[PDB]
């Protein structure tokens, strides 16, 4: 919801307790497109696979 520049990674830490993390996207071609560089806590992640 943070905007077209954002995706959120939510993951299950424990049964019934989930963490929500902000992913910043940069360099988008279109609203539907992936940003070339992902960011979290100011450090960069190169692709979704790196985040996982």
């Amino acid at each position: 919801s943070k905007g077209e520049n954002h995706l959120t990674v939510t993951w299950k830490v424990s049964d019934g307790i989930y963490q929500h993390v902000d992913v910043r996207e940069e360099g988008k071609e279109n609203a539907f497109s992936l940003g070339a560089t992902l960011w979290i806590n100011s450090e960069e992640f190169e692709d979704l696979d790196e985040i996982v």
Partner: protein
């Protein structure tokens, strides 16, 4: 790498196949002596599969290298 045979990983996980800690082969390949008689001999080779678990002795040994593409594959 051993049977020189391509197998889709699709079936390997679908078959329930179990994992090695790393890809190091003690393979048989019969090699010809300079007088032409072939007989196999092998001593450690290590191909990278879980690189950060690697011990301090081994890391800087790369001679040839299977790449996926993204540079994050090599972090650390």
């Amino acid at each position: 790498l051993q049977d020189l045979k391509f197998v889709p990983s699709d079936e390997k996980k679908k078959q329930g196949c179990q994992r090695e800690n790393e890809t190091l082969i003690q393979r048989r390949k019969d090699q010809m002596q300079p007088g032409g008689t072939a007989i196999s001999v092998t001593v450690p080779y290590r191909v990278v599969d879980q690189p950060l678990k690697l011990m301090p002795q081994d890391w800087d040994r790369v001679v040839a290298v299977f790449v996926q593409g993204p540079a994050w594959q090599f972090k650390g």
